[PDB]
Amino acid sequence: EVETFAFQAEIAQLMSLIINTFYSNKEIFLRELISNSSDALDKIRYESLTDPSKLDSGKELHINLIPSKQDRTLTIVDTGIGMTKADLINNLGTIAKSGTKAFMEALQAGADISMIGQFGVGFYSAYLVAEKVTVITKHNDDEQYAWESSAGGSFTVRTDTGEPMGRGTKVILHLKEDQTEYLEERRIKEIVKKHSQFIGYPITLFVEK
- Which residues are annotated as part of the binding site? 36, 78, 97, 123
Checking 107-115 for CB contacts under 8 A at 24+ apart, the result is 107/17, 112/25, 113/18, 113/21, 113/23, 113/25, 113/28, 114/25, 114/28
| Nearest C-alpha neighbor of 78 from the set 29, 136, 130, 126 | 136
Which residues in this chain contact ligand GQ6 in the complex, by CB under 6 A? 36-37, 39-40, 43, 78, 80-83, 88, 92, 95-96, 120-124, 135, 147, 169
Least distance (Å) between residue 209 CB and ligand GQ6:
25
Binding site residue list for ATP:
36, 78, 97, 123
Pure H helices in the chain: 9-20, 28-48, 85-86, 92-108, 185-195
Q: Partners of 137 in the beta sheet?
A: 145, 169
Nearer to ligand GQ6, 43 or 189 (CB): 43
For residue 74, the minimal CB distance to ligand GQ6 (Å) is 14
Report, in Å, the least distance between residue 25 CB and ligand GQ6. 18
Nearer to ligand GQ6, 103 or 182 (CB): 103
Q: Least distance in Å: CB of 197 to ligand GQ6?
A: 19
Nearer to ligand GQ6, 84 or 179 (CB): 84
In the bound state with ligand GQ6, the residue whose beta carbon lies nearer, of 69 and 94, is 94
